[PDB]
Amino acid sequence: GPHMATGQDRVVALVDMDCFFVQVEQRQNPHLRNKPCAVVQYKSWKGGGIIAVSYEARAFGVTRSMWADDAKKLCPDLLLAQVRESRGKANLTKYREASVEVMEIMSRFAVIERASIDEAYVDLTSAVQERLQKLQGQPISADLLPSTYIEGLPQGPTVQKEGMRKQGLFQWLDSLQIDNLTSPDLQLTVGAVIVEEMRAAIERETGFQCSAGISHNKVLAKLACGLNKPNRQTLVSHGSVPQLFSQMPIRKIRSLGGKLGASVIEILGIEYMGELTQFTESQLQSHFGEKNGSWLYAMCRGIEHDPVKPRQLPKTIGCSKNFPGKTALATREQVQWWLLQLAQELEERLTKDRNDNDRVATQLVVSIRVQGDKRLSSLRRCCALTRYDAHKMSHDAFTVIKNCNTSGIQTEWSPPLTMLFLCATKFSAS
DNA sequence: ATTATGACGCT
DNA sequence: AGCGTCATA
Ligand SMILES: [Mg+2]
Ligand SMILES: [Mg+2]
What we know:
Blueprint: E1 12-17, H1 20-28, E2 37-41, E3 49-53, H2 55-58, H3 68-74, E4 79-82, E5 85-86, E6 89-90, H4 93-109, E7 112-116, E8 119-123, H5 125-134, E9 148-150, H6 161-177, H7 183-206, E10 210-215, H8 218-225, E11 233-235, H9 241-246, H10 259-268, H11 281-288, H12 290-299, E12 317-322, E13 329-331, H13 332-357, E14 359-370, E15 379-384, H14 390-401, E16 412-429
Parallel strand pairs: 2-4, 9-11, 10-11
Antiparallel strand pairs: 1-8, 1-10, 2-3, 5-6, 7-8, 12-16, 13-16, 14-15, 14-16
Bound molecules: magnesium ion (MG) (2 copies).
The structure holds a DNA duplex.
Family: Belongs to the DNA polymerase type-Y family.
Binding site for Mg(2+) 2: 16, 118-119
Cofactor: Mg(2+); Mn(2+)
């Protein structure tokens, strides 16, 4: 009763830029705005691979991972923007720099954890306390929440989308004002006010739109974010969790979209997150291990404690290129040349990093894949990284991998290499 | 022949 | 340390 913790101590948001690489290209090229548009890398093989898709194009069935030639079959008028190529490979610098624009704006409001190139968790707990003070018990007006959905409302005893949104928001705010909700619900609401402000500042100062989730932890905030896209934000309250989870496929929850989630479904014979509540913590630990079991037991109740880490910068800076099909690297100098290409981009990004962020990478990570091997990495070896010099890094990389070559002939490379990867890690303050 | 990333867990 | 998992544009 009085001692059951409810995972309602924090306010956490997850902000995710809508179709981010597409918005970066649309800001640069006004001709692409408000059109079915996608971003593609390379062009020769089947028109290139799509890596981002505008919501106008999604309506035609265009998706990420699709070949541009195939996307054009679904959407003949699809417009395309190409990822820059430098030194023979895709170069994502424009999007990394746009990401920094957005992350720096978010950081004015609160501590953020960079979760990917286009999304960040926000810990709003302190900001909410301060805003609550500034307020002096004044009601929160719907006008402060013009793009917010309250998940699960309206309910109980209009056929337009925006009308539905406001109906639910009014029920929520009516109940908050009447004192029929909880202090955590008030805290979430103020959290949502702050995220409207954050999202307005991002759009004003960059041109970019985003969606966001506001809840009591990272997992719920991420889930919330996806419920109403694009350009909207969603509040998932603790109380909304039983109904939300009762029909929520397990694979939709962050970290359960893969093999673990599949085993939860198979071993337990269930489909929805809410069905997990019927098992004891020990039962879940017996199937999924101590850590995952405890996590599952709390998560299916809407409770999770993973903190928003104070980390706005990436921990690693990496450079990779696949060499698929017949392009697999088969000669020694081929391997050396591409190692150099990679090492040159890496040096460029590392020198920029050292200047911007007052740190130095100390470990060089070399990874390769060989043909018809594994998936992903076949092999991964570390060596020291003492100097930001591309020729040295490339020579060093060759050294740690050169004995992978099973060839008799040292000029030839067998089995052919289908992937090269250089990654700088173990940063120290400098 | 999605590609190019990036974080974290296991042993 | 090296490998595997899960995720994002
Ligand atoms: Mg996303
Ligand atoms: Mg994202």
